Design a protein around this ligand. Structure first.
Ligand code: HEM
Ligand SMILES: FC(F)(F)c1ccc(-c2ccc(Cn3ccnc3)cc2)cc1
Ligand SMILES: FC(F)(F)c1ccc(-c2ccc(Cn3ccnc3)cc2)cc1
Length: 391
């Protein structure tokens, strides 16, 4: 039986996705746990699944369900956004993580420019993942959360394990989870934390209108938004920079006309292979999806690059076109109930990171042949361990 995932490489889509989309856009596969699942790979069917709440994210955590991979968080946390909504906290969380907070965009620029200055001073080769994209992501999310910049690196080092995609439970994941929860609980008791997401959560925690919300949920919001945000933005920016380096004509165009960078980033989002696995959902009813009657209790995997390279929806899908008529209709941030709450911040992180890099390193290029990149395996993202460049 066809095993997923197909390839950990984030620099090229396997030829098999297109043939699967054409012939079997919903197809039975085996996951790394040994469970069976339905892999959905066309734009039409991917959108159907994500927009039908009966395909439940929450129920993927039920005991005895077929699993894509092992949980790395407590089962209740799989429903974290539903818990946030039920607590009446959605508006406050969204307001705290907008890229339009005063001084945040300028903080992003100053930080990106400082990171790039340090690389230039040290001399090529430079590692654009470990010494640019991930530190930029980490610094951004410390500022967004309102926590000390010096705490970022230790929090960041949990993520190589927290976002593993493993057949079995991971002992280190619980060690790091409990420790990072204790950190965020301490932050909520820290009177000097008055800004960002944790500053706001700290205030709502003492507000009688939120008296019933548990201290547990408040800390969980901090841990999960730091982790999801840092791993997602660092990983997306890293693999977007590869796609840009691989396209010197686009690199030069965006350097010459940086007003096109937002449109470029939107296409880089569309063609991005950062998510290593399909998005998992558990059917809570018998539901027809294409030629398959998905049965209650079965696992469905929504393959984002299946949708995003679907030639029916995105003609010439492998080509970056800055003037498509449906440019944000990609699924890089998902779709439906669980659409990424950090999408605006993720866009701005990448836009500013690319703007700064192209200004400082207009001649940026890989310093090793592309096949020498080492792609992380059994992880929820596809990323190179190091991204060596010259300029
Ligand atoms: C380019 C950057 C990003 C990408 C590509 C991305 C991608 C995604 C996708 C595809 C989903 C849907 C998962 C699903 O439906 O199963 C998602 C959800 C989520 N994202 Fe992002 N994300 C990014 C940035 C961020 C940031 C900056 C934050 C927070 C600061 C964040 C926090 C979350 C959270 C908490 C969820 C869970 C939503 C839910 O369970 O309803 N992400 N993200
Ligand atoms: F909202 C957040 F906190 F961000 C959040 C959102 C979703 C998850 C999630 C974790 C795993 C799986 C799949 N899976 C594997 C084994 N069992 C279920 C699906 C969803 C976790 C946290
Ligand atoms: F170990 C910590 F650092 F504490 C840690 C552990 C796990 C998470 C986590 C947050 C969300 C999701 C689901 N998810 C992925 C992309 N979008 C949603 C999975 C994992 C965050 C932090």
């Amino acid at each position: 039986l066809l095993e997923v995932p197909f390839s950990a490489r984030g620099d090229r889509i396997p030829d098999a996705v297109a043939e699967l989309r054409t012939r079997e856009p919903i197809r039975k596969v085996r996951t790394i746990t040994g469970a069976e699942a339905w892999l959905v790979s066309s734009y039409a069917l991917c959108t159907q699944v994500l927009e039908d709440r009966r395909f439940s994210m929450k129920e993927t955590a039920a005991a005895g369900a077929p699993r894509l991979n092992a949980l790395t968080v407590p089962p209740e946390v799989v429903n974290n956004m539903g818990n946030i909504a039920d607590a009446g906290l959605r508006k406050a969380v969204m307001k705290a993580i907008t890229p339009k907070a005063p001084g945040l965009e300028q903080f992003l620029r100053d930080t990106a420019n400082s990171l790039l200055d340090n690389l230039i001073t040290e001399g090529a080769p430079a590692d654009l993942r470990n010494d640019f994209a991930d530190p930029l992501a980490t610094a951004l999310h410390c500022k967004v959360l309102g926590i000390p910049q010096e705490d970022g690196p230790k929090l960041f080092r949990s993520l190589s394990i927290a976002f593993m995609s493993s057949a079995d439970p991971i002992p280190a994941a619980k060690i790091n989870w409990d420790r990072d929860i204790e950190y965020m609980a301490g932050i909520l008791e820290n009177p000097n934390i008055t800004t960002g997401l944790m500053g706001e959560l700290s205030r709502l925690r003492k507000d009688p209108a939120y008296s019933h919300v548990s201290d547990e949920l408040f800390a969980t919001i901090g841990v999960t938004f730091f982790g999801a945000g840092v791993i997602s933005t660092g990983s997306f920016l890293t693999t977007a920079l590869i796609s840009l380096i691989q396209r010197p004509q686009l690199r030069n165009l965006l350097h010459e006309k940086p007003e096109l960078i937002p449109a470029g980033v939107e296409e880089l989002l569309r063609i991005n292979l950062s998510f290593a696995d399909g998005l998992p959902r558990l059917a809570t009813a018998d539901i027809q999806v294409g030629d398959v009657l998905v049965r209650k209790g079965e696992l469905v995997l929504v393959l984002l690059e299946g949708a995003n390279f679907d030639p029916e929806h995105f003609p010439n899908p492998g080509s970056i076109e800055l003037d498509r008529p449906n440019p944000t209709s990609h699924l890089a941030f998902g779709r439906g109930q669980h659409f990424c709450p950090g999408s605006a911040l993720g866009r701005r992180h990448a836009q500013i990171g690319i703007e700064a890099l192209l200004k400082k390193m207009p001649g940026v290029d890989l310093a090793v042949p592309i096949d020498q990149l080492v792609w992380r395996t059994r992880f929820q993202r596809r990323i190179p361990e190091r991204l060596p460049v010259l300029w």
